[PDB]
Symmetry: D2
Amino acid sequence: HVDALEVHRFLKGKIRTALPVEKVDRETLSLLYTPGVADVARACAEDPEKTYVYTSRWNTVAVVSDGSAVLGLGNIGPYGALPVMEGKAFLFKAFADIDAFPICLSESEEEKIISIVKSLEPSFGGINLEDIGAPKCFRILQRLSEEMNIPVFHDDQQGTAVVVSAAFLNALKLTEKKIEEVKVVVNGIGAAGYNIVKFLLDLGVKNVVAVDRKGILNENDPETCLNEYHLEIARITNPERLSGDLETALEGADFFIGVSRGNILKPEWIKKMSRKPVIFALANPVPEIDPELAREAGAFIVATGRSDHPNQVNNLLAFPGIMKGAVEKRSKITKNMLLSAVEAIARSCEPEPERIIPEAFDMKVHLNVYTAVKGSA
Amino acid sequence: HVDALEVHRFLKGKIRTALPVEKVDRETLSLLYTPGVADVARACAEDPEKTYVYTSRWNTVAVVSDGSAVLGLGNIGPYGALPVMEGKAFLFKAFADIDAFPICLSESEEEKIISIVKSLEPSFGGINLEDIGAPKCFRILQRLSEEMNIPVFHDDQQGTAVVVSAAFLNALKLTEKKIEEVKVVVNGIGAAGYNIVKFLLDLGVKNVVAVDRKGILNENDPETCLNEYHLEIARITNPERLSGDLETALEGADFFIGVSRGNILKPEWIKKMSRKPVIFALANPVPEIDPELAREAGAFIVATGRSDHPNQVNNLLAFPGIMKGAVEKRSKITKNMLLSAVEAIARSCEPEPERIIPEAFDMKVHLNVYTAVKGSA
Amino acid sequence: HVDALEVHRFLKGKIRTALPVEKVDRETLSLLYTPGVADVARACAEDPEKTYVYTSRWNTVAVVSDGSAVLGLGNIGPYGALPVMEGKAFLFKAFADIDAFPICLSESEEEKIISIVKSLEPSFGGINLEDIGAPKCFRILQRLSEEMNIPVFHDDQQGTAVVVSAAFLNALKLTEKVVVNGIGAAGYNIVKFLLDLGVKNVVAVDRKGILNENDPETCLNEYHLEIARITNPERLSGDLETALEGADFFIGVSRKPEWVIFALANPVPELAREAGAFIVATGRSDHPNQVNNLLAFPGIMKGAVEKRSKITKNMLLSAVEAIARSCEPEPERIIPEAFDMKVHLNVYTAVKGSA
Amino acid sequence: HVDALEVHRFLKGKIRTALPVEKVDRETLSLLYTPGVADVARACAEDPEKTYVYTSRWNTVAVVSDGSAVLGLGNIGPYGALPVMEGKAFLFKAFADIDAFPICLSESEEEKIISIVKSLEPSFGGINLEDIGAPKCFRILQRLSEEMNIPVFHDDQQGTAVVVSAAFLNALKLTEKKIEEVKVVVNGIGAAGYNIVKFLLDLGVKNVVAVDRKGILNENDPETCLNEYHLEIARITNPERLSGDLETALEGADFFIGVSRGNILKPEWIKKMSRKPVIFALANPVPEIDPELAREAGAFIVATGRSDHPNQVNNLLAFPGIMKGAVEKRSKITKNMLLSAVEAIARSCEPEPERIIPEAFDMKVHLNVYTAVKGSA
């Protein structure tokens, strides 16, 4: 009977601050505050880059949310978001030694978020956008990364894409199929899906069939398009010009990657997919199909977003290293950096069907991602 | 002999974060992050007050500046401000065990600042405005404290006024004069001066005479009104309707409180003030008159802003206790609470001419301030 | 309603260490380890006092126990004592900012304990003996405090006596002007404080009755003999009931109603309310009027370590007075609670000032 | 001009403690102290292994010295040792997250040290003996590791031997010679030398030649045997039954390993060693021969104990992982565990002449050593 609530109540928060020194005397204050701190102020005004030498800015990250898409719970707001962003901050400290600080905003208009986060630049070495709904989060990420001079990263977009891509590459190796030749069905084209399709295409997949809640995205019957972003996905997708529902998409498919809803992939559809079919059922918290059921129906490899099962595709393998690398580099996160991360995660294990990527507590992963990202232009 | 710069470089910042637990395993994450943290999110969304029980909000404070008036250096900006705000955060932790975090903004238009800070409400239990220039900081303070539901406190305004008030009360006790009957000259109607005038009035002084760089403030010599705030001060000031320069003001005055520029009060003017005259010459870093010189010219009590001399009037006596009390009470900071603090500081020692207030390393002071503020809320 | 065990399990201890710096690079190591640290070594070897300037010694305290008298549980040993010493260390940091560290020893012969603790002198600025049984703890305290040159303090003797004395003085004030039961570590020292304070009729009682040199059965060691010699005015004698009959005060380190009550045994002695009777003090962090060491040790240790001298009668009585003056006594609150920070500041100030 | 002394003074120590929780109230005490702690006390008395579950014992280590052999300084005592043991503790935390405490003893008779440290067993998960002179440290290590049920490790003996061994294996590989055929001269048979000899023999070296102040160790020249431990070494070394000084020993030698004094190996001797000679000159702080001088005289590979030069053979690569592994395993440190560490360090890089082992800041090493040690007998 050890409750998450009980333990939060007892800890009164997961976020501590802490002093460099124990004793605080006249001399200490004259150094760390007035009058000595004036010199450090003069220095940082004359040259902002010197904040990276004389303050904590070289290692501080803002975890920014308006709570418009918290976990699986939806748009619950900044107050609901706060304990979740404290948890992320805790993870940042524990897995990367990054001093992360939750910034939960009571503003949800795009343009306003964007100008608020821009204003924080002097205070942080990096920005981690988290649990901000789609499609606004597409514009918010693009704008802030383009206009800020510290790295800006959105887990549910770039993190998921990185880890899905590394899993995909290893499953594909096990499958023994050519990347240019496989048919990959991606279902659920919100933040993750949009970015997954883009990774898959950069990597070499040529036949990506995208699907969302009114079917396969197709210019020619464009009832298939909630958003402009789905427009963009059909322009670069579905080479065979297929049309119909998920079930139709899966005919002959080699991979299904779902970042969508629970229990929607029926088991008999697996038998209409190609031989040695791979199923990434990452809907949170209930996967698109139950993993055992999928195994029983013939799946070669099954992955989910849960720690309950083997082959957990989890953002945690990505964000510590990426953020650490990017913040040290001090520049914009680039495609090359994200693909270095993909490759690092992938090579961080010898793939087997029951283990196509490492687990997050394997500290070598975080090291290798860090290194990969630090080293890339 | 150690440099402020060298030690900052070595420390790479004065701000740490730190974790509740050492070991981080599957179980710990299931409690402090997913899935357990979803319960906590649901509870805080349902009732935002619960952030005070389940997160660090009960003890976190944002130290907010745009760097428009840093220490004695002026409008150097948010980067120069950062190491200073780090210093302030250090002090909050050391003297009140408050987890303070610097928020240095690259926005300096007053309406934009206001709206940025408002949006941060969910992430903090209190706001400490710091080193924001006058006159914009008057409106900023007023608006944020009226519109936010966590306390907002600006040191240079409210802290200085609190300490100056407590100093004034004790000095007045030692002088043996009636508050209704004394003439008090306040010179320099900026951040501090403005607020010092208002406190003195709230306290019961009747003859306050305000002075700035174009002379005594009087509604009928409109030259003397450099903004709307000076006009406001002129309208609640100067009962005898006096007109002229600082020298004229001081004729018969009992107190001079200067928060202005260096070596401005000529020693011979002291002899034209009333008997047992009191001189708070708080201009930083050079006082309005040299303290020994003022003693020599007949000053009964002399106080400055420096540690160099007896009677250091410094904000540090005020902000720890006030902020701790206010965040705990969760309410807006009120005239009551500020006056509690004044009285608690004043009663924190037995006044004599060379010691009219306590030193800031006397930890009884911070406890008494804290207790006073907690109790009037 | 979270369990003490479950939370100890989740915390995996109440003791952390922590680094001054975050980033650790070639430069940092060259300053804090080799080769820079050799200069600091040379300096401390040439002058041991410099450990107070260059190391954490100025603020570290060893919390020493063999587990021979743990809380109310008895001689459970060093392993049972460990989570308790961890608690005491936690309190030391919380209430005095002292970096305390548990030293639970698997040795219980007194001369060996004494020489082990002596050998630790270079590593600490102070020693807090804790939960070591009587009567060996009387010799252990005296020897270590006489032979070491850092302060050594034993809670259950000096801390309990301080707090009991402050409680007593305030209770006496409310009374508008004394039986001590259980003459172990605490009782012994409680008796002597009450005498130093001015009480004339102290009556000491232990498991064989009221201590009277003329009834030799009542003298379980030399120390009870000593107490019998400076206690009991109407040279009276018998068990407790006779001991307590029409009684100024009852003070117990212990385990009928009819005859001010500090009953301070772990769990209880002897209605602790609704059986009448004016003032009622527990040991518990549970009920009104808790007489606990916590009010004393933080401040006393902080003061003593800073003054660097041996703890004296004067310093302990400072503490007694500072705790007693730390509130306005009313029957339901004859002393402050431990989380009133003012108390620890006042104790610290008092002890510093009498050093 | 930034001094080690100045910085130590400013930090007033490198050791902090820190609390799990920030606020302390009635409820907290009732859980972490009386009366709740009594249940934890009962549990640990009933079963001492439960200290690993309910206290910090699972992760605390005593750093034990009497200061009989501090750094390169000698027998300076426990006060001189203290700032050094604080440094070691700081390393333990930084590289392994181990909570290490300095225990510097004012007792230096060996039996007395032994009984003191045994008495501390309930308070620690592990013992790190440090800077205790030879030959008493031989008996001290052996007795404590035999008699205690927490691991006991002495750096200068076991750590130095582990790192020297890995360096040796990699150097040997680069050399392309067979381990059973090389002549290896070890000079300075103190805490390190004794153990280095024994590891090399375990590893497969057959011609090890031990040398100390009175010459090559040889039972037949009894002068050469300064204690029983040198006699022991003489009996398992020097198969060719050589006799004479270091210079004689080096004729035809393939490796020199010195853990002795500065500037004793003359450059021209290198030319009488075999082809592609390897020189580990680890005397601290001045090497047995200047490294450049050695290169200039024909050395194929040169290593020292300093960070000043390539190929730093330093204990830091070994102790964090070893201690962490051992303390978690809870059992006695074994020969298999130490050889796993040797292998793990060696494989943690691709050896080249200018880099035969990794540097300590390569965090992969510490992970690999930890894994190796945790996994072995």
